[PDB]
Each structure stands twice: as C-alpha cells, then as structure tokens.
UniProtKB/Swiss-Prot annotation, chain A:
L-arginine binds at Q169, W278, Y279, E283. Heme b binds at C106, Y397. Isoform N-NOS-1 is expressed in brain and colorectum. Found in the Auerbach's plexus of the enteric nervous system. Isoform PNNOS is expressed in the penis, urethra, prostate, and skeletal muscle, and coexists with the cerebellar nnos in the pelvic plexus, bladder and liver, and is detectable in the cerebellum. Belongs to the NOS family. It comes from the Eukaryota. Homodimer. Interacts with DLG4 (via N-terminal tandem pair of PDZ domains); the interaction possibly being prevented by the association between NOS1 and CAPON. Forms a ternary complex with CAPON and RASD1. Forms a ternary complex with CAPON and SYN1. Interacts with ZDHHC23. Interacts with NOSIP; which may impair its synaptic location. Interacts with HTR4. Interacts with SLC6A4. Interacts with VAC14. It is found in: Cell membrane, Sarcolemma; Cell projection, Dendritic spine. The lineage of its organism: Eukaryota, Metazoa, Chordata, Craniata, Vertebrata. (6R)-L-erythro-5,6,7,8-tetrahydrobiopterin binds at S36, V368, W369, F382. The PDZ domain participates in protein-protein interaction, and is responsible for targeting nNos to synaptic membranes. Mediates interaction with VAC14. Ubiquitinated; mediated by STUB1/CHIP in the presence of Hsp70 and Hsp40 (in vitro). It comes from Rattus norvegicus (Rat). This is Nitric oxide synthase 1. Produces nitric oxide (NO) which is a messenger molecule with diverse functions throughout the body. In the brain and peripheral nervous system, NO displays many properties of a neurotransmitter. Inhibitory transmitter for non-adrenergic and non-cholinergic nerves in the colorectum. Probably has nitrosylase activity and mediates cysteine S-nitrosylation of cytoplasmic target proteins such SRR. Inhibitory transmitter for non-adrenergic and non-cholinergic nerves in the colorectum.
C-alpha cells in the first residue's frame, strides 16, 4: 500500500502514497506488464463529479465547508436535471492544470502550474474554432518566447455533437506518396494529408508544407483553414561547425501543439483541447529527423560528414545523430525560439518529482516515455525508478475522427 | 486469450499466446505499473507440481510427451520427493533447464544465442577449493583466447537453506573500488562494499584503478574463502581510439569476460544458488554504463576536456559527443585485439529477428523494454520501436539477497 522508488545513481528513496488515489486501469496485470505498449449515463457521472469537487475544494483549503457542500448539491441538482453539468471557470482552470500535472508521459511537468487556459466553451462553428486557434498560436508563440497554453472547446454532450481538431498537432508538415514509390515530406501524415486533399486542399506538394486545419464543430462535417503563414514561426536548421548543414534544406516549427487528445475533468469530456508548451531538442533531432519512418535523414547526413558507413560498429549512425541534435538546439537558440535540451529537461523533471513526492505524496511517471530517445543513461531519469498510474483529471487518447465520423 | 504487440516503425504485428503459461507475479497490477522498478526451503507440497510442470515441458520438447519414459520419470521423481523431500535432475534435464532459463530471461538482449550454451555440471562439488577449480576452468573455456563461448557452471542445489553454495562476487571478474579518507573513490565505486569484505577476509589490496578482485567462495553453507584467479586466465583489453591518439593515455582497460555470478537458477522447483554464467559484451555495457555512469568510472569530463568540446553549457551536447567517442573506442579496441564484442546496433537487430522467430515457433518472447533498449542512442535501434510484453516463465534466473546480508558466520 505504501510504495518505494529508488534512484540508483544517488540512492535517494522516495515513498509513494498518491497511487492509492488511482482511478483508471493501467493495462498491466500481476501476470503481464504492458509498460511498453503505446495504447493499452447519469449514474456514472455523479461520483466522477464528486471525486473532482472534493479534490478541488481540498486544494483551496475548503473541504467540507459550506461552499463545498453547496456546489456538490448544485451539480447534483444539475446532473439529475440535465444529465450533464457545467464547470465554473475556476474548476476548468484547476482541471486543466491538473490534467497536465497528472500526465505520466510528460517530462516537462515542472511547469504545470504556469498554464494559460483559454476558455472556448462559447464556440459554435468551425470558423470560431479557427479564430480561437490562431489566437492560441500567436499567444503561445509570443515571437519565440514560448508560453504554455491550452484552448478548451465545448464538452461532449450526447456524443453526436463532438468538437474535434482532426489534425494531430496544430502545426505539422504534409506527407505525399509518389509514383516513384518513396515519400515526400513527413510520412507520418500521409493519411491525414489525403483527407485534406479529398476535402479540398490544394497541396503545393513540397517537403515542408504546413498542413491546414481541419476543424469539426458541433458534430458537423469538418472544414479547412490555412493558419496565417505569418503566425507559424519556423526555424531553418544550421550547424555551428558544419558549413554544408544548411544545404540539406531542413527546417522545423517552433510550436509543438498536440491537438488530438481528450481532456477529462470531473467526468466531463473535452474532445477538442489543443495544448502547447515548447520543444525538447530530441523530439525534433532524434525522432522527427531520424526515425526510419519519419524524415529519416541519418543516411544523408553521415555521407556529408564522410563517416565510414560500411560497418555498424564505427557508430556512424550515433555520430551523425549527435550532430543533427547539436544543429537543432543551435538553430533554435540562434533564432531566439524557446527550446530545452534533454539534460536540462530531465534534470528539471527529477527536481519536479522530488517536489511532488514531498508536497503531494508522489508523481505518476512513465519511464519508457520520460527517458530521452538518445543518451538515456547519461540523463538522471534513466536511473530513477518511477511508478506509472492513472490519475484524473487526465489527457487521454481517443479514436482518430475519420474512423468515427458519420458524414 | 491472444495479446498483440506492434512495431511502430514497420507496422509488423505479432500475437502472444505464450503468456498463458506464465505463473510467477510481475509486481504490476491493474492500478500500477512497476515496469521500471529494478527489484519488484520449499515444502514437498509445493515441490511436486513444479517438478511436474517442468518435466512435462522437457518431455514435450523432446517429442516424448506421455511416453513410457515420461511417465516413469514423473513416478521416479514423485517417489524421490516423498522419500527425500527433494530430487536430482538428470544431466539432460539440467542442460535443457539452464538453456531455458536463458531463453526466458526477459532483460537479456543476447538471447538469439540461447541454444548454444556450454553447461558445466558442478553438482559433485563439495568445497570452496573445488568451486575455485570449476570457476577457473569455466573462465578459461569461455575466454577461449578472445573467441568467447557462452557458458554456465552449476553448483549443487539448495537443500535446507543452511548449506548453500554461493559465489559472493557479483561477477567472476570485476575491479576493486576503494573509498579514500577524502571521500573520493579509487577504482570502481560499484565494488567498494565487496572490496571491503575481501580486505577484511585478508585480501592484500594493490590499491590501484584496475585491480581484479579475488573470488570469495562459499561451499555447503561454510564461511567463504578467498582465491586469486590466475592472471594469465584474465583476458584484458587496453582501451584506445582509432583517430584520437591521446585516448590511450587515459590509462583505461576492461576485462573481456562478463560473468554474472550472483543470480539464482530455478529449474523444476529446485534452487541453484551458485550458477555463474557468461556470454560476451555488448559495447555499451562498458562504454556507456561502466565508464560514464556518474556512480561508476565517471570519465565523461576528462574525455570531453581532452576533445576540447564546449563544456560551458549542456546544450552543446558535449556529454553526448564524448559518450559516442568512448563507445567507438571500446568497440575498436576489442575488435583490434580479436576479443568478441557486439555493438548495440547489431545486437538489437539480431534480438528483433530472434523475437519474431520466437513468436512464430514458441508463441511469444517475454522482454523487458526498459532493459532491452540500449543506454545510448535508444530510438536509432529497432528495439525502441518494438512493443514488448514482460512476463515470468520458468526455468528462470532470479535475483537473490547478497550473502553477506544473510550468512550465519561460523568463525
Ligand atoms: C512546457 C514545455 C513542455 C515540455 C518541454 C514537454 C515535454 C514533453 C515531451 C518530450 C513529451 C514526449 C512527446 C513525444 O515523444 O511525442 C511530452 C508528452 C506529453 N506532454 Fe508535455 N511538455 C511540455 C508541456 C506540456 C503541456 C503544456 C501539456 C498540457 C497542458 C503537456 C502534456 C503532455 C502530454 C499529455 C504528453 C503525452 C502525449 C502523448 O501521449 O502523445 N505537456 N511532453
Ligand atoms: C552471449 C552474449 C550475451 C549478450 C551480448 C548479452 C547481453 C546482455 C546485456 C547487454 C544485458 C544487460 C546487462 C546489464 O545492463 O547489466 C543482459 C542481461 C542478462 N542476460 Fe544476457 N547476454 C548474453 C549472454 C547471456 C547468457 C549466456 C546468459 C545466461 C545463461 C544471459 C542471461 C542474462 C540475464 C539473466 C540478464 C539479466 C541480468 C540482471 O537482471 O542483472 N545472457 N544480457
Ligand atoms: C514501443 C514503444 O512503447 C514506443 O516506441 C515508445 C517508446 N518511448 C517513447 N517515448 C516518447 N517520449 N515518445 C514516443 O513516441 C515513444 N515511443
Ligand atoms: C530505474 C531503472 O529501472 C534502472 O536504471 C535500469 C534501467 N534500464 C537498465 N537496463 C539495463 N540493461 N541495465 C540496467 O542496469 C538498467 N537500469
Ligand atoms: C508534447 N510535446 C509535443 C510533441 C511534439 C512531437 N514530439 C514532435 O517532436 O514534433 C511537447 N513538447 N509539448 O508541448
Ligand atoms: C549480463 N551481461 C553481463 C553484464 C556485465 C555488466 N554489464 C558489466 O559491464 O560489467 C552479459 N553481457 N552477459 O554475458
Ligand atoms: Zn507494468
């Protein structure tokens, strides 16, 4: 019931009690660990509501006060009457900050309490969604001095009037299969791009075409919009030592903004809740650039560095990887766009874990996602035992809308 | 039930049925994953089903399930258990058992090799000197002048828990660590406590940065005894770099034979508390962990100093740069001296092939992603992208408490 986690580099042992407040299921059993798997009515709603208001009122030191009991009554009244209920602005902000706080795959949670919440629950159309999103984009980007933000569209009702951003992130690049057989641009977005084209988008068929937004309001058929090019801050990639690096013609965008997740607060479901912070360097330079099913540039880069690519044991892939990652960090820092390196981010997360342990009784963390995709063991998180469990409010995966939508 | 795992790089999907045969616990529950936790005297009653399960597995593997030889062996084992409270494995079963413990070892990336294991039967051993002799022969055999061969040596099983055979060393070959009065450490900080025990037992310490530790060997529950492995049997590799000529002046070397000696081998309910085994190194074990962990030799600074990297900010990736150069050095050195070693690309790629074959032929391959993914360059290896299922099959290798914590000293 009381659980210990040990850091094997420092011997510091922490005690976790927060896991006893765990709501949802992990995917694991006593027989099988699924730690590495990517994706493992009125009566339902009141305990969920209660559980949430209880933690809310506890957080503002007013547990069992008049205002607390009155609110539970009011919400109780409203559920019984309307089958759903509405959050106060205060609850909405608390809920969103806590969904981030509870995100076990997020290394950047030291920042959790500095989140700008944009309430877009008064939104009714796709043009309105586009407006809200442009405003979020400009606010978060802040001319390169990035600020964390979330924009929250209206909650699910009967489930046939869902708000959804069909895009996986607000800003991503198009993917195109060619007669050649190869892939131009980002192979991860080939399918979404096809959906855009069949919906009407004139694709310029280039390597780094910022995708348009495909926005769905009120369960209606989704609609296309180009984000003002002037609002999409992009960074050309160069190297502080390699003159040739720029000739690869690589760029990335400054704003990482996940737009396909579902925010659950007090049982209510917010199916459109795009949020953004800022990049850790490895996300772009290791994953986006070097994954075999992504831009897959290691082969080209190693060539230009004239490494011996005959045998895997020369560590040529490893050498190029480091340089590509040096260039990403340098390019962002030179253009004054917020970015964090994996050493600094993981050092912060360890400090955050210690704060959460002493102030909250723990910190759900998924080691598989928290450890950076390069240089794992030279970052402190590699050596830190973590317990993974699901707390609410939460960000959840949800099915991609094209498989769900009834046109 | 059928469980699917996906590779997110290739979209190849595999189906696991093998997990249905898993008995032991993971530490995880429906409410908590303990997948990153390092560490999450049997009755007659508990012993017979364990023996039965094992013997059924053994007889199935040789295509003799339900045969007269199978049934006679169950009855013979049953009788032996009721009469003596334990039983003895036939040589054939011991070999099968030891190979399957390796096959089942979910944290081992080298399992493509599982069917090629030389098993040395040391169950006739009675004394610490006997153990020393067995271990010397294991080292010489496995080393093979640099052309490493996988091996395990199996000492007598647990009886009453008061007569255990144990190798107190965590690996047969390791370097001493010494805590200085000024709080710094000479040698390997991981081995300070064990080095202190050795000294107290009467080892005369040379007190340098790479002193091969003596063996501390416990036979039949007696107090352990010290022995020095003959130096001519300990193959070592001076570390140098293919392009950086100052690298040799760091004074680094490592030993060629990685030989885990502190684990417990479970076969058919029987417990083999001393079962040292060895394969060969994957380069990152030495170049990433042994050299660059902060709590190990911790050489990152000195290497980066010598490379003249910008060290004023982490975001130069200086640590990452030094790290790669050190790992190139380790692979180059071992290759140049004709000592078996495998790089993390080759080893992970082979593991994925192994894993896919096991799914097809066996119905699964339990694997601990946290341990399988190498400690540098994670996602440019195919294992990072492979979903895995972790579960516990027997025969198995298990952790056991350190013997200095449990031993009853006789004096
Ligand atoms: C402030 C800067 C932030 C940093 C440096 C950061 C860091 C990261 C990183 C590196 C990942 C892994 C991404 C991947 O591999 O695909 C991640 C995942 C995640 N983060 Fe953050 N984060 C930040 C802000 C935020 C914010 C503002 C939120 C929500 C308000 C958030 C919630 C999440 C969630 C839910 C995931 C998992 C997403 C998934 O499963 O795909 N993070 N974080
Ligand atoms: C043949 C070459 C082999 C290679 C390249 C290899 C590779 C590895 C590596 C890199 C690890 C992780 C080590 C660490 O981080 O401490 C490991 C773990 C392990 N391997 Fe192997 N292995 C090999 C042979 C063997 C053999 C012969 C056995 C036993 C018969 C074995 C059983 C295990 C076990 C039980 C672990 C887990 C150790 C622990 O939990 O501390 N392996 N393997
Ligand atoms: C199969 C495995 O779970 C998968 O590759 C994970 C591993 N760790 C990860 N870690 C992060 N941060 N992001 C990812 O997409 C992944 N992918
Ligand atoms: C806390 C964490 O489980 C621990 O540091 C693990 C991570 N993965 C590992 N993987 C291997 N191969 N060896 C290790 O010692 C570790 N250490
Ligand atoms: C969640 N993450 C954004 C994910 C972006 C993605 N990994 C990418 O590398 O493009 C993040 N840094 N939060 O803002
Ligand atoms: C288990 N592993 C050996 C472990 C050795 C350890 N990583 C070391 O570097 O000393 C191995 N390759 N087996 O042969
Ligand atoms: Zn688990």
């Amino acid at each position: 019931r009381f659980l210990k986690v040990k850091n094997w580099e420092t011997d510091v042992v922490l005690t976790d009690t927060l896991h006893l407040k765990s709501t949802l299921e992990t995917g694991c059993t006593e027989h099988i660990c699924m730690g590495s798997i990517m994706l493992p009515t009125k009566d339902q709603l009141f305990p969920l509501a209660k559980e949430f208001l209880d933690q809310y009122y506890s957080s503002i030191k007013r547990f069992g006060s008049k205002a607390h009991m009155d609110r539970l009554e009011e919400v109780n009244k409203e559920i019984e009457s309307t089958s759903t209920y509405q959050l106060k602005d205060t609850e909405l902000i608390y809920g969103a900050k806590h969904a981030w706080r509870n995100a076990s795959r997020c290394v950047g949670r030291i920042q959790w309490s500095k989140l700008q919440v944009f309430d877009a629950r008064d939104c009714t159309t796709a043009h309105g969604m586009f407006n809200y999103i442009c405003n979020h984009v400009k606010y978060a980007t802040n001319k390169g001095n990035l600020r964390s933000a979330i924009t929250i569209f209206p909650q699910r009702t009967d489930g046939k009037h869902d708000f959804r951003v069909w895009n996986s992130q607000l800003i991503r690049y198009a993917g195109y299969k060619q007669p050649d057989g190869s892939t131009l641009g980002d192979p991860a977005n080939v399918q979404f791009t096809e959906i855009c084209i069949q919906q009407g988008w004139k694709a310029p068929r280039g390597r780094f075409d910022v995708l348009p937004l495909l926005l769905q309001a009120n369960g209606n058929d989704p609609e296309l919009f180009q984000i003002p090019p002037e609002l999409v801050l992009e960074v050309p990639i160069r190297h502080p030592k390699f003159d040739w690096f720029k000739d690869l013609g690589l760029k990335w965008y400054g704003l990482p903004a996940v737009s396909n997740m579902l925010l659950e607060i007090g049982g209510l479901e917010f199916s459109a809740c795009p949020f953004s912070g800022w990049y850790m360097g490895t996300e772009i330079g290791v994953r986006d650039y070097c994954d075999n099913s992504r831009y897959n540039i290691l082969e080209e880069v190693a060539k230009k560095m004239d490494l011996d690519m005959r045998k895997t044991s020369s560590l040529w892939k490893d050498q190029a990887l480091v340089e590509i990652n040096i260039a990403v960090l340098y390019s962002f820092q030179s253009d004054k766009v917020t970015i964090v390196d994996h050493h600094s981010a993981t050092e912060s997360f360890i400090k955050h874990m210690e704060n959460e342990y002493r102030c909250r009784g723990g910190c759900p963390a998924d080691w598989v996602w928290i450890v950076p995709p390069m240089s794992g063991s030279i970052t402190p998180v590699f050596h830190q035992e973590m317990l993974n469990y699901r707390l609410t409010p939460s960000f959840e995966y949800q099915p991609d809308p094209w498989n769900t939508h009834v046109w």
